[PDB]
Amino acid sequence: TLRAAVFDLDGVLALPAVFGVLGRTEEALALPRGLLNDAFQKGGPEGATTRLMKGEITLSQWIPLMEENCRKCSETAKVCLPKNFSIKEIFDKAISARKINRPMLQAALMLRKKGFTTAILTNTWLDDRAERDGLAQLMCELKMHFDFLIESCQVGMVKPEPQIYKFLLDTLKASPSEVVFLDDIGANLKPARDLGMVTILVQDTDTALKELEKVTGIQLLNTPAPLPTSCNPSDMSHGYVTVKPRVRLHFVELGSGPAVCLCHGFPESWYSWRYQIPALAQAGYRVLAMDMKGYGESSAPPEIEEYCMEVLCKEMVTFLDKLGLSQAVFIGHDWGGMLVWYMALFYPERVRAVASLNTPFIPANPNMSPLESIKANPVFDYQLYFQEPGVAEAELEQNLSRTFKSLFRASDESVLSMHKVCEAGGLFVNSPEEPSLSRMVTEEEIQFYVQQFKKSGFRGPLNWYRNMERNWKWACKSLGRKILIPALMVTAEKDFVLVPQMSQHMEDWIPHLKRGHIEDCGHWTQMDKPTEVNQILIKWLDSDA
Amino acid sequence: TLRAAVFDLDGVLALPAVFGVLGRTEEALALPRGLLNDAFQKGGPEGATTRLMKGEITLSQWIPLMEENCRKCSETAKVCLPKNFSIKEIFDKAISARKINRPMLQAALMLRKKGFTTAILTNTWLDDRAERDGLAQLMCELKMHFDFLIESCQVGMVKPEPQIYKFLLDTLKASPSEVVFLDDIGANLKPARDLGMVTILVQDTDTALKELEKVTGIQLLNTPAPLPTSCNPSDMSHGYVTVKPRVRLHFVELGSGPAVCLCHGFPESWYSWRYQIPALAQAGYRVLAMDMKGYGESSAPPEIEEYCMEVLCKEMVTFLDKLGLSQAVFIGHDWGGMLVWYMALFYPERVRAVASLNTPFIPANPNMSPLESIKANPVFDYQLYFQEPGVAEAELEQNLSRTFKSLFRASDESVLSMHKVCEAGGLFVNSPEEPSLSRMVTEEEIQFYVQQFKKSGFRGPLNWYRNMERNWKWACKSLGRKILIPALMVTAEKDFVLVPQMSQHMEDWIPHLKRGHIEDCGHWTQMDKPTEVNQILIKWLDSDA
Numbered sequence A, B: 001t002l003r004a005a006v007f008d009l010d011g012v013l014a015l016p017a018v019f020g021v022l023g024r025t026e027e028a029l030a031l032p033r034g035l036l037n038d039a040f041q042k043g044g045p046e047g048a049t050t051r052l053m054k055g056e057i058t059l060s061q062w063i064p065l066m067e068e069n070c071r072k073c074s075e076t077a078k079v080c081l082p083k084n085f086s087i088k089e090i091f092d093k094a095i096s097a098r099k100i101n102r103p104m105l106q107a108a109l110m111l112r113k114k115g116f117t118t119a120i121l122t123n124t125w126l127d128d129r130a131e132r133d134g135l136a137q138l139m140c141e142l143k144m145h146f147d148f149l150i151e152s153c154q155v156g157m158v159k160p161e162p163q164i165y166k167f168l169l170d171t172l173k174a175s176p177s178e179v180v181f182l183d184d185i186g187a188n189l190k191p192a193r194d195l196g197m198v199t200i201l202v203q204d205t206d207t208a209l210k211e212l213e214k215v216t217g218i219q220l221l222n223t224p225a226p227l228p229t230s231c232n233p234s235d236m237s238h239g240y241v242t243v244k245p246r247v248r249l250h251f252v253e254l255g256s257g258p259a260v261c262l263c264h265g266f267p268e269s270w271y272s273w274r275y276q277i278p279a280l281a282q283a284g285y286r287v288l289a290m291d292m293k294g295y296g297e298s299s300a301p302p303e304i305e306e307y308c309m310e311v312l313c314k315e316m317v318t319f320l321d322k323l324g325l326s327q328a329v330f331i332g333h334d335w336g337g338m339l340v341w342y343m344a345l346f347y348p349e350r351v352r353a354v355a356s357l358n359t360p361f362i363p364a365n366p367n368m369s370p371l372e373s374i375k376a377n378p379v380f381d382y383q384l385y386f387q388e389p390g391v392a393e394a395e396l397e398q399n400l401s402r403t404f405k406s407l408f409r410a411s412d413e414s415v416l417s418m419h420k421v422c423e424a425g426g427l428f429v430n431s432p433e434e435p436s437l438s439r440m441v442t443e444e445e446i447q448f449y450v451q452q453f454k455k456s457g458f459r460g461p462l463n464w465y466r467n468m469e470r471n472w473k474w475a476c477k478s479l480g481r482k483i484l485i486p487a488l489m490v491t492a493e494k495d496f497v498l499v500p501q502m503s504q505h506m507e508d509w510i511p512h513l514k515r516g517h518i519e520d521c522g523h524w525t526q527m528d529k530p531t532e533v534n535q536i537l538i539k540w541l542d543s544d545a
């Protein structure tokens, strides 16, 4: 009975195989068949290639030895190599052209999701080329999806020597019969088979996967589109910045490149961006996913004034100062979306680009009190219920699991009405004691929000809604201004509070505004439609930021 | 009696003044004298420039209004503007050409060091230009050296209106008589003077500084070269990564750009790089200053094996994996320098470039036990004293303040002999009970190391020296390899343990090796010669990494 799946890198998890390049070069340069491939394996287990794969020497040390072997091979079959022939050039292009075989990775992901131990076993080299980062990036993207990465050059062993196979089984802590081993090389498959492992010769991916699903009893082909990679909180780099004596800001950080600051809404967490963090980091960005003031591991002072937009923005500017960041792209959702428009209006020099999910930019009305404005729209009734200190705190803090289960629902799910909340006497008055689990969240993810909210509760989060007059007065100072830096407004079709039509006049204040629209998407944009959020943000980031 | 110094940005802390550009443009384009300057101040306190300085509108909104005023001014003095005339172009160049007036900043730094409250008071704009980052960077570098930054566009007030002066005094919490105010504009100085503040009209910096020192009684001109900017631990972004169930790694992070991983030696801290962190971040790098395993806020497991080079390196690779960094430049000193050569030899794909201070790269001798090798050199006797678990821990942990005061000394100071430490029966046996304070460290900085070492003590740190056999066996696997990635070896003339001559054969294994040499420098390179360390590292980073 199987419980472990092992995959080769070249020709299995990564395509095209860096092996089929010697053949391609021979054909392209009208060279004798197998000429370059012979020079590659010259001397068998004692030759340059075996020493390279065992980690005795590095790739840059192997390059001149492979070149020598290429000449000695051309000498025997009495032929001549083109004057411009370069092994480095051939390998640089081959490695660079080699990409992840996505359906193979999807299959490995699915097997691991069903309780399988997954491993990459590969004959590889110590890459010291000036262009080594390309493959380093590829190994990083691949490895985090597996339990083990066994590299020949790191272990000093090589396929097909049987010591690497016994090493593999020892790291797996499994008997060969419990192991599937996928390889594109027949000779490297053989020792795994003669040990009693289930084996698959990988030519085309589809056939290999049909064999893989027939042998495991798990559907791997024609499976629904998977969700993007999520975050395991304990596997993240956690950052902490003191923005003032009593205020510390917590953030999760992933990636390299331009700084992208993610600002969640109410009542959320850095974890609300779990599906965006790995995707945006993979797209070449330095992701800084915040626990906004009043949330999770960030400080939560009790005072209402501590949560007005002016202080929140100033604190975010200090956060940039302390991290040594002259700018960051600011991406917000809900209350975070509102902060992010105010960062752009008051601190444009600190904002590389501004993006908002669901939250529109609506200039303050200087001829009307904000309380009047909120009352003029039935959907903003929840904001009036949030005004009285302690009332919403008691209801929201009573049963944390019920709070998040009731709040975090997709549009098709029996969502709370944000209409007549004051009259009804609360948010969950017509809601069950034991809400069903939404398809957007697992029980474990709900328990993360529960644990996070146990520290400070809902006072600080609710205080974001308790500065309407203060924020209105501050916003009125910006009435003559326009947002002229790169900006993205993402609308969610089925958000019945932050409705897409509320964003219709934004071009009057943001003329160069770019847009995105997510159909069949509720209020919780990031978890409702993660794939499309990532697609819209990456595309906008690569074009404008 | 003075206790506060206020500085203007334009023409005072920053040069050349963005004002003298309108004059330069007029002269360069043979335009009537004061033509561009008239259009600039058109309408006085009701014109476009006042609205811009008050934050009513942004710089990009002001650009077309300034262009209109430029035409109306040319209309009156019956002249014509060159067909290619662009206000944006003129201002982009002016802002870009404007740099920090270093002697003015040095004076402000010196005043603040003597207990003065320092402030920047400036008439500025909300910069939303596509090239706004340049000035954002300049404001970041300037502001962190001051107690307050008062910007006209943020406060909605402007010089010379007297409300900004009363605002300034309120933020300073000081009576005008306790305030020096430096301005290059006579009109902006006037309200500060008529309030009773000490005032200085700034034309040339030298005269302004002579006036400033005569008035404060503090030497500001012809003063010795200052030390580089240091770190205040509580003002840093602190990062934490779990590299394995029982191991968490702590680091301080500053800057944006390529990742630079700083690896301290024994018995140190991330704080050993206090003078490098702000400098390297300012040079365009993302600084990650580690608390190495066994130190400060990083985990310190008791087992000796937890500190062998193989596990330390693997853990550093996991650190990169968890942060989402495909590469980092690795900069090490002492034990950190040794780790950094092993990162380059075993993980070249993860190392952008490798630099070591004092620690040479010497390939392992496979024909001699490492214990024999250490014994063959009298200077490595301290390593033999460090072998017996508990012996060095007891001596080093007895009086923490004495330990750091005895260890951290410059070459001219009465340093400990690393010779005959076993025979003598310890490191501090011929050392005083109350060592004098070295010129390299303050009492406060000593107390930081003291507090840091109170958590885990010297077991984990000393365990780095207790894996000689294990490290030798691992190093022997790399004997066929060469270091072919960018590498820097920095030698310290007066390090009597890690002597510069021990590095003489390094080109045999690192052929493209680049070098640096610090004269009159002891073992504690970073704090002994901070200015020259920064100069060597920045120059090497900008050229090779």
Ligand SMILES: Brc1cccc2ncccc12
Binding pocket: A266, A267, A407, A408, A415, A416, A418, A497, A498, A523
């Ligand atoms: Br809280 C909150 C704010 C905005 C929209 C919402 N939609 C559904 C449930 C809760 C919501």
Ligand SMILES: Brc1cccc2ncccc12
Binding pocket: B266, B267, B407, B408, B415, B416, B418, B497, B498, B523
């Ligand atoms: Br601990 C140590 C290691 C290496 C060199 C040293 N020099 C002076 C004082 C202590 C030292």
